[PDB]
Amino acid sequence: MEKTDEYLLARFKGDGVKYKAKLIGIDDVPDARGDKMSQDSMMKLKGMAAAGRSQGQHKQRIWVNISLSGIKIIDEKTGVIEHEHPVNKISFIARDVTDNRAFGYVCGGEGQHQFFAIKTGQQAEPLVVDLKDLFQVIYNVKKKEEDK
C-alpha cells in the first residue's frame, strides 16, 4: 500500500523506530548541505576508523532511534543517550554512494555544522527513507495545520 500521513504518524510517534549501527565518526563541516562536502567528510572519517581498526580499536556500537523527536544516538552497551538531534536542526541527509551500509547527516545551527557518519548493521537505505518520510510528515502536518 501507500504510506499515509496517518501511517507515518503512528510509526514515528513516541519511541518511533530503532536501528542497530556503529558510529563511524563526527566531523565539523563549513556548510549545512553538500554532496561533495559530505563525501569528503565520510571518506576522511572512514580513513580514520580504518587506522584505528588496524590497532584493535573498533567503532562504538549504537542504536539510531528515529521519531518525531528527531534522531537519538544511543550507546548499545549502557543505554546512555549520546546525542539528540531535533528534526529542525538536521539540515542534510547524505547517502553514501560507495557503501550500501553507510550514510550520514549534517546537523546543528548556522556556524556550527557537524557531519555524523553512520555504519548500519543492515542496509542503510531503509533508515534513509525513514528520515525522508519523517521530514515529509512533519511538513504535511504543519502545512495542514497552517491552512487551518
Swiss-Prot record:
Post-translational modification here is noted as: Phosphorylated on serine residues in response to mitogenic growth-factor stimulation. Phosphorylation during mitosis is leading to membrane displacement.
Q: Cystine bridges: which residues? A: none
What tissue expression does the UniProt record report for this protein? Answer: Isoform p96 and isoform p67 are expressed in adult kidney and fibroblasts with isoform p96 being the predominant form. Isoform p67 is the predominant isoform expressed in embryonic visceral endoderm.
Domain (PID) ranges = 14-148
Where would you find this protein in the cell?
Cytoplasmic vesicle, Clathrin-coated vesicle membrane; Membrane, Clathrin-coated pit
Q: Which residues form a coiled coil?
A: none
Effect of changing K22A: reported as: Abolishes binding to PtdIns(4,5)P2
Give the knockout phenotype.
Embryonic lethal; embryos arrest prior to gastrulation and show lack of endodermal organization, failure to thin the distal tip visceral endoderm (VE), elongate the extra-embryonic portion of the egg cylinder and properly organize the epiblast. Loss of the specific megalin/LRP2 lipoprotein receptor distribution at the brush border at the apical cell edge in presumptive VE cells.
Any idea which residues bear Phosphotyrosine here?
Y139
The listed outcome for K22Q is: Abolishes LDLR endocytosis
Assembly information from the UniProt record? Interacts (via NPXY motif) with DAB2 (via PID domain). Can interact (via PID domain) with LDLR, APP, APLP1 and APLP2, and weakly with INPP5D (via NPXY motifs); the interaction is impaired by tyrosine phosphorylation of the respective NPXY motifs. Can weakly interact (via PID domain) with LRP1 (via NPXY motif); the interaction is enhanced by tyrosine phosphorylation of the NPXY motif. Interacts with LRP2 (via NPXY motif); the interaction is not affected by tyrosine phosphorylation of the NPXY motif. Interacts with clathrin; in vitro can assemble clathrin triskelia into polyhedral coats.
Q: What does the entry's domain section say?
A: The PID domain binds to predominantly non-phosphorylated NPXY internalization motifs present in members of the LDLR and APP family; it also mediates simultaneous binding to phosphatidylinositol 4,5-bisphosphate.
Biological role stated in the UniProt entry: Adapter protein that functions as a clathrin-associated sorting protein (CLASP) required for clathrin-mediated endocytosis of selected cargo proteins. Can bind and assemble clathrin, and binds simultaneously to phosphatidylinositol 4,5-bisphosphate (PtdIns(4,5)P2) and cargos containing non-phosphorylated NPXY internalization motifs, such as the LDL receptor, to recruit them to clathrin-coated pits. Can function in clathrin-mediated endocytosis independently of the AP-2 complex.
Name listed for the protein in its UniProt record: Disabled homolog 2
Q: State the organism of origin.
A: Mus musculus
Q: Which gene encodes it?
A: Dab2
Full protein segment contained here: 33 to 179 of 766
